[PDB]
Amino acid sequence: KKEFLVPTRGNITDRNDEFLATNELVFGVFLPSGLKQKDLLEKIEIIQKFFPNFSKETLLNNYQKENSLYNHNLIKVVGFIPYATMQPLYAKLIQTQGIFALPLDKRYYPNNALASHVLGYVGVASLQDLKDDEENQYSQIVGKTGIEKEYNKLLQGKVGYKIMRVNALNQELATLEVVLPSTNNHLQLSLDKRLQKEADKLFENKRGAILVMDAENGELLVAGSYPEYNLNDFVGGISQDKWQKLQDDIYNPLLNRFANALYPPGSVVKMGVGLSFLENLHITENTTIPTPPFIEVGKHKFRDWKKTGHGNSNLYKAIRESVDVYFYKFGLEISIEKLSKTLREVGFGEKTGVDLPNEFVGIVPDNLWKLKRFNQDWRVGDTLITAIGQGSFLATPLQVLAYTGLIATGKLATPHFAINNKQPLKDPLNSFQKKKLQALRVGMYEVCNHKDGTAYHSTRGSKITLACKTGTAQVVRSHAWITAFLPYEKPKYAITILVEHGEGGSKLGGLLVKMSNKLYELGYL
């Protein structure tokens, strides 16, 4: 009756205990390391006769990896046999000289690509990891991206292993007992597997990102970066080829588009700019100015999204019909310092503070930044391009999401996955600003619900009342934003949707409606 230190790792579940990440128990077949080239092939022969399956080439190959996840110092793993298969042939395989069968509780992702950039994958700990370590983290198995890395310590458990017993008695079958577990390491995410699937359906041929947040605390119900990758491909430690084809896909599936990609926010920053206008200028939301197809400054002319122009327009209307010239005009009057302050406040400067390694911060172009990095001081027209969320203005979908959350509720939520991060709501806006958000919400409600709103024909057939804002980002065909909260009458959720080359905002409303309806259908509303 032999016992084994079986390497295991914690479970990752969705907000309803549905398994996002877990383990399956197998046997690894191992050979002694530093083995003679003549022995090796001979012992490989015996293994494939036991398990007529394994390709003589892939066993040799396996034995020769220099980044195996489960290798010992003096024995190397050549293959992964299911318990069903190993059971009958354990004893005779033990009996053969120089061959070992060791239980391994390896990673298994049941839903494959689902939430791949959220969950992330386990891998062999590298030399640059080890050389940089400041916490006596000497484990060969560690998380490499997303949650796996973020909570590696929690998920790895106390020592990284559990103790199992195998009884290949006089009997002809191997039983398997767990004598000591590795407990206190289940992690529970706020995701809803069911919603994440609807998100996966919505982006079936598309590229970009989608987030659905509880704006009262930060819980991310959905978080997709499309295209996703199939986490299982990384389980034994990624196949050198399988790695290539993930790196060479021109759609770039390794990138996290919701946390680690930048984009101009475009028209979506209009509420925030408008807030700055109200703070800093002798204006109310109801102040009405004329808004031709264009105005000019000196050398250049600044054009409205469409050439008809809009006639007269106040802030409600500007938001409603995404009027570029309103913002160009008052952009002339506002100070970039006072603008960029407003923008930073509502989130666009720094990180949202999400449970993922290396969240990206964007760029809020101000005047102290043009002088430092470049040389000339800030020109007036530069404000105007920033006022409509383009030029050197870059942001993540999370920043847009969090901004939307702030506009909806008055307080900045910290988007997170891990359910047990009490993430207290931050309050960056003052009483006057919170008061003035009221206008902005009505604005956003008009975009979705007033017949001239840009997303009116877009967002029809919605169970719950939506307040939304569409945008486009120019490319460094145009990226399309839609960002929203619901219900309008009493806001709880925020949704942010980015499609690369979706082009507009009145294709995306259909997606907002779809996800919004799937929420009501599953009783979140």
Author numbering: 45 to 520, 540 to 588
What is written in the article reporting this PDB entry?
Penicillin-binding proteins (PBPs) catalyze the two last reactions in PG biosynthesis (GlcNAc-MurNAc polymerization and stem peptide cross-linking, or transpeptidation). Class A enzymes can catalyze both reactions, while class B PBPs act uniquely as transpeptidases. Within the elongasome of a variety of bacteria including E. coli, Caulobacter crescentus, Bacillus subtilis, and Helicobacter pylori, PBPs have been shown to interact with, and be recruited by, the essential protein MreC, a bitopic membrane protein that is essential for cell shape. PBP2 (residues L38–L588, thus lacking the TM helix) is a 588-residue molecule that presents the characteristic fold of class B PBPs, with an elongated N-terminal region followed by a transpeptidase domain that carries the stem peptide cross-linking site.
The transpeptidase domain harbors the active site with the three conserved motifs: S–X–X–K (Ser311′–Val312′–Val313′–Lys314′), which includes the catalytic serine, located at the N-terminus of α2; S–X–N/D (Ser366′–Val367′–Asp368′), which lies between α4 and α5; and K–T/S–G (Lys513′–Thr514′–Gly515′), located at the C-terminus of β3 (PBP2 numbering indicated with a prime symbol). It is of note that a disulfide bond lies in the proximity of the active site, linking β3 to α9; a similar positioning for a disulfide bond in SpoVD (PBP2) from B. subtilis was recently linked to regulation of catalytic activity. Notably, in the crystal structure of unbound, closed PBP2, hydrophobic zipper residues Phe71′, Tyr127′, and Tyr134′ are covered by the anchor region, indicating that binding to MreC requires uncovering of this apolar patch through the swaying movement. A structure-based sequence comparison of class B PBPs from rod-like bacteria using the closed form of H. pylori PBP2 indicates that residues that line the head/anchor interface display clear similarities among class B enzymes. In addition, in structures of unbound class B PBPs from both Gram-positive and Gram-negative bacteria, analogous hydrophobic patches are covered by their respective anchor regions. In order to further characterize the “opening” mechanism of the N-terminal region of PBP2, we generated a “disulfide locked” form of PBP2 by engineering two cysteine residues at sites Tyr134′ and Ala218′, predicted to be well-positioned to form a disulfide bond. This mutant was unable to bind MreC in conditions where wild-type PBP2 could generate a stable complex in gel filtration.
